[PDB]
Design a protein around this ligand. Structure first.
Ligand SMILES: Nc1ncnc2c1ncn2[C@@H]1O[C@H](COP(=O)(O)OP(=O)(O)OP(=O)(O)O)[C@@H](O)[C@H]1O
Lengths: 101, 381, 250, 54, 217
């Protein structure tokens, strides 16, 4: 904490929607590309909170193609996948609070 | 673009004199309506052989019209300052005019200008394919072959998953059209799921063709999983007559009722194989194969049968059976001989040690040929 | 365990949230599942009662006490804190509004006066917070049917719907799905029974379940008929038999 | 929430299963069914009365 | 029948979008979705559902859209594809996260998941859903839920034939209300085939399905 020899400090924000578009794009390319190219929509509509968040979206959208026994994703799947991942993040984190203020 | 496949299949019924006189002229009225609508004067000259000069004046006119329209446009666009983008979009509209009139040659030329100025890699692949389509329209398969080769170079250069789905169907049609029905069986069953409607032979047609390639190639076991229980074929139901005829055939094979199989075979030959252009040439290949495959399955379940019994089941004469089977035996799938006098069809199939001997001796002989050729070569050099 | 600052109520906690106040909430949770639903034309409050000893009389355990004849209360928590707090509510109200303004309080004013008492058992050091959190459901003319929560801190809030106790989670969501304020009262009573029925299924008999409404006047229960202008009692407590009727309507 | 929620979180732990312990009728009914299978029971009283009472 | 029904619907869908609420337009589309299903037109019934559907992805939650998914589920079972029958059970369940939905909404929810596992050759899972549905239908007003109580009673019976436990065929069958009010030809059908399966008499099974032939049908 106190002076010594630490000097450089780099601050990392949690992603913005622009940055989120980038992370999401490149994983989708490697995997199966989002059809109708609404991966841009998904990032514009909402922000996640982490790039960890974003890789979770990637996995789930792909799992939805697996249940049908399809091997390709569509926009319909990302729209389901996002709501599930992101909402779950909020319900685990809010429970701690009672009813203060 | 879109009218070309519709025009050509109608033109092909008219060409044929096999089909019912009714269908031939029913098709005459229909092809005529689209001939006028699209102005097909250069292309009418190809079609009139194979079975008004106004169509030509209308042509030439359409020429100076649609021909001029694009010209002066193209020029204002080359003057105006954004070279890469604007000129190339306009050259895409240029290729559309030649493509309307059924001239595959000039369509190739202007669409080449379009590519020339730099456009999106994905966009280049859309363009190559457009040319490719016009190769089916003439029925020049050699033309399609080379066009489709240039697409597969660019398919993974781009990463395009979007254009990969189209390529699957076009390549399905390519393989279907050619004599190799092996690749076709694979390419087309996966084009069912990934069907892209845009400039291609209807969804109903694809589904029928998949079944055809299914039946030729795939084992009894492998038909059940991939074609019968195939979730899409069941989603699409049987509505069109051709789908019904081919589908019903599949079913009675598995269920091994051979009272209803041979009537269905007659139906599929009339209404499915002969009128489809691709399967007019392959009618012979497909029907000879079906006869051998059904008879092979029945022989496997019997050490011995009567000729009267095999025949009676089919609903063909003892005489008829005797000739048709003796065509199929020397090609060797049936694996049987017929005692005429006793009338028995005895079945002799190896499954023993002999199987594993033949495979070994043949493969190992193929290897030795290669050792000799290559060894002797390297010594000299 | 916690700090000596947070046990003290004369001492700002590090967090600034007393340990104390938090203990009061742990106890509220431990008690019964009590609820309140607001209707156009009524308020229904309903709760389950402690089974206690086998030979202990159930009737005498009362978790709904009428504060005035037109305004009732319901709580989760301990008996002793409840009764003492309750005598204080009535008493402070008489002084400050039944002699001054010579009439029953507005619901809002009564709720305000109950918070203040609460607040003083949290301010003064060495005197623990009331062990109980209320719902004060009521009816007054000016502001119609009204529904409140009063916290042992001494903050109060009006609600559309609230429930407290162990089964608070469960209940609140059920009310949402099935009902909204604009719906009539009659529907809510059937609904409230079902909600409380998730809580416990061994017995749901009308003996162990205390159900009341604050709604319309009853000019019969005015008790000095022949004068009509005086409002009758708004509150009417529904007997066990009456509950059982309402169970066959579910 | 025994685990830190910010640190240990979805996409390490992208499935986080809550088990019913308050439980539904069906869920109860299956557990009684493990027993009902294990040994025959001589019907002498309502079977379903027991479920509801749990 | 067809003619009367179809003409009325069309005419009715125009008044709503010209002077009244877009809500009213949507209620009439649930009627139209049911009408196509009864014609055994499953292509037409999916196409109709889909025209709406995008604008009601927004509004997805309403008990009325819970019923649209449930119908979709039905529509794919009869088309005999189980890829999307499974897919459409999930949607129904999403849009009833709160399971506190009306009695009829709940009956149909349980019963689709049961039938789905019938095809999946699990008759532990199938049986359990049927039971919950059993109870819903009896406690419902018997407008036509008395006939549909019977259909579930046969499905309960059906599971236990497969598992070849004839003890539980006698257990279900009681004089409480099963052989009384929910008695059918098909109650007798199920217990007869059940005794034939147990003995190992294919001969007995063949006799049973001649006289219970309309039950298979
Ligand atoms: N009296 C002093 N003598 C020397 N340098 C000083 C003095 N006061 C301030 N400094 C400044 O502080 C800078 C860094 O000192 P440095 O951080 O190496 O020192 P320290 O006190 O030995 O600590 P640590 O090992 O915890 O970093 C020096 O380079 C110099 O600029």
């Amino acid at each position: 904490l106190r002076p010594g020899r630490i000097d450089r400090k780099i601050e990392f924000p949690p992603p913005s929607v622009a940055a989120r578009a980038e992370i999401l794009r490149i994983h989708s390319r490697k995997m199966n590309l989002t059809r109708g190219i609404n991966l841009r929509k998904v990032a514009e509509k909402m922000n996640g909170c982490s790039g960890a968040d974003v890789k979770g979206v990637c996995t789930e959208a792909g799992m939805y193609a697996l249940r049908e026994r399809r091997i390709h994703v569509t926009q319909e799947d990302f729209e389901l996948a996002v709501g599930k991942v992101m909402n779950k993040n909020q319900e685990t984190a809010i429970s701690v609070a009672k009813l203060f203020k | 673009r879109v009218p070309n496949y519709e025009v050509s299949e109608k033109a092909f019924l008219l060409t044929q004199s096999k089909v019912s006189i009714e269908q031939r002229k029913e098709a005459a009225e229909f092809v005529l309506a689209k001939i006028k609508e699209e102005e097909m004067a250069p292309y009418y000259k190809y079609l009139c052989e194979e079975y008004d000069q106004e169509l030509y004046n209308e042509l030439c006119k359409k020429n100076e019209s649609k021909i001029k329209e694009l010209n002066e446009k193209i020029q204002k666009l080359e003057e105006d300052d954004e070279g890469e983008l604007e000129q190339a979009q306009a050259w895409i509209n240029l290729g559309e005019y030649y493509a309307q009139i059924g001239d595959k040659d000039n369509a190739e030329k202007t669409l080449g200008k379009s590519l020339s100025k730099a456009i999106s890699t994905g966009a280049k692949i859309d363009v190559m394919l457009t040319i490719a389509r016009l190769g089916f329209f003439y029925n020049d398969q050699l033309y399609v072959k080379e066009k489709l080769e240039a697409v597969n170079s660019m398919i993974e250069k781009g990463g395009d998953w979007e254009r990969r789905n189209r390529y699957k169907t076009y390549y399905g049609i390519h393989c279907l059209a050619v004599r190799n029905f092996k690749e076709a069986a694979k390419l087309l069953v996966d084009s069912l799921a990934t069907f892209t409607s845009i400039e291609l032979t209807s969804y109903e047609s694809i589904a029928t063709y998949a079944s055809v390639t299914g039946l030729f190639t795939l084992e009894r076991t492998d038909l059940k999983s991939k074609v019968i229980d195939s979730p899409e074929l069941l989603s699409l139901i049987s509505t069109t007559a051709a789908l019904q005829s081919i589908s019903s055939l599949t079913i009675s094979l598995y269920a091994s009722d051979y009272a209803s199989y041979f009537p269905y075979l007659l139906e599929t030959y009339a209404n499915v194989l002969i009128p489809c252009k691709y399967l007019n040439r392959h009618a012979d290949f497909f029907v000879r194969e079906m006869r051998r495959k059904v008879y092979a399955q029945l022989l496997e379940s019997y050490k011995t049968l009567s000729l009267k019994s095999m025949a009676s089941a089919f609903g063909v004469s003892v005489a008829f059976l005797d000739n048709d089977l003796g065509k199929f035996i020397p090609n060797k799938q049936l694996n049987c001989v017929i005692d005429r006098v006793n009338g028995i069809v005895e079945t002799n199939r190896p499954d023993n040690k002999n199987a594993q001997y033949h495979l070994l001796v043949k493969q190992g002989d193929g290897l030795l040929t290669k050792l000799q050729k290559y060894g002797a070569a390297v010594r000299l050099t | 365990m916690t700090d000596r600052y947070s046990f003290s109520l004369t001492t700002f906690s590090p967090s600034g949230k007393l340990g104390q106040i938090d203990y009061a909430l742990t106890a509220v949770k431990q008690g019964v599942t009590s609820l309140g639903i607001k209707a156009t034309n009524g308020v229904v409050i309903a709760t389950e009662k402690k089974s206690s000893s086998p030979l202990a009389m159930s009737e005498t355990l009362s978790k709904v006490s009428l504060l005035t004849p037109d305004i009732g209360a319901v709580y989760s928590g301990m008996g002793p804190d409840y009764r003492v707090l309750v005598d204080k509510s009535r008493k402070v109200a008489h002084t400050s509004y039944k002699r001054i303004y010579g009439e029953y309080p507005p619901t809002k004013l009564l709720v305000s006066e109950v918070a203040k008492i609460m607040q003083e058992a949290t301010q003064s050091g060495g005197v623990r917070p009331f062990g109980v959190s209320l719902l004060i459901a009521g009816h007054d003319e000016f502001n119609g049917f009204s529904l409140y929560q009063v916290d042992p801190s001494g903050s109060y809030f009006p609600w559309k719907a609230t429930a407290i106790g162990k089964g608070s989670v469960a209940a609140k969501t059920f009310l949402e799905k099935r009902w909204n304020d604009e719906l009539e009262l009659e529907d809510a009573i059937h609904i409230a029974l079902l909600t409380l029925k998730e809580s416990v299924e061994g017995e749901f008999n009308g003996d162990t379940i205390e159900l009341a409404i604050i709604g319309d006047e009853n000019p019969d229960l005015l008790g000095y008929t022949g004068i009509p202008t005086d409002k009758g009692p708004r509150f009417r407590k529904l007997t066990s038999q009456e509950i059982n009727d309402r169970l066959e309507a579910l | 929430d025994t685990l830190d929620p910010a640190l240990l979180r979805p996409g390490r732990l992208d499935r986080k299963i809550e088990f019913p312990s308050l439980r539904d009728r069906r869920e109860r009914r299956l557990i009684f069914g493990t027993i009902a299978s294990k040994m025959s029971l001589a019907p002498e009283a309502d079977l379903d009365s027991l479920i509801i009472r749990n | 029948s067809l003619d009367d029904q179809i003409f009325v619907c069309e005419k009715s869908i125009e008044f709503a979008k010209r002077e009244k609420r877009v809500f009213l337009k949507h209620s009439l589309s649930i009627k139209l979705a049911t009408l196509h299903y009864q014609k055994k037109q499953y292509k037409d019934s999916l196409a109709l559902i889909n025209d709406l559907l995008r604008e009601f992805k927004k509004l997805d939650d309403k008990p009325s859209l819970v019923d649209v998914h449930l119908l979709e589920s039905k529509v794919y079972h009869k088309l005999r594809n189980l890829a999307k029958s499974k897919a459409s059970l999930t949607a129904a369940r999403t849009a009833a996260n709160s399971i506190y939905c009306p009695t009829q909404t709940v009956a149909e929810l349980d019963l689709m998941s049961g039938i789905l596992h019938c095809e999946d050759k699990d008759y532990k899972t199938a049986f359990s859903y049927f039971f919950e549905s059993f109870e819903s239908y009896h406690n419902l007003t018997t407008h036509n839920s008395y006939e549909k109580a019977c259909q579930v009673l046969k499905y309960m019976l059906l599971s236990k034939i497969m598992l070849n436990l004839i003890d539980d065929v006698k257990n279900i069958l009681n004089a409480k209300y099963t052989k009384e009010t929910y008695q059918s030809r098909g109650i007798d059908a199920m217990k007869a085939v059940a005794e034939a399966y147990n003995n190992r008499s294919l001969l007995d099974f063949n006799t049973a399905l001649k006289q219970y032939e309309k039950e298979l049908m």
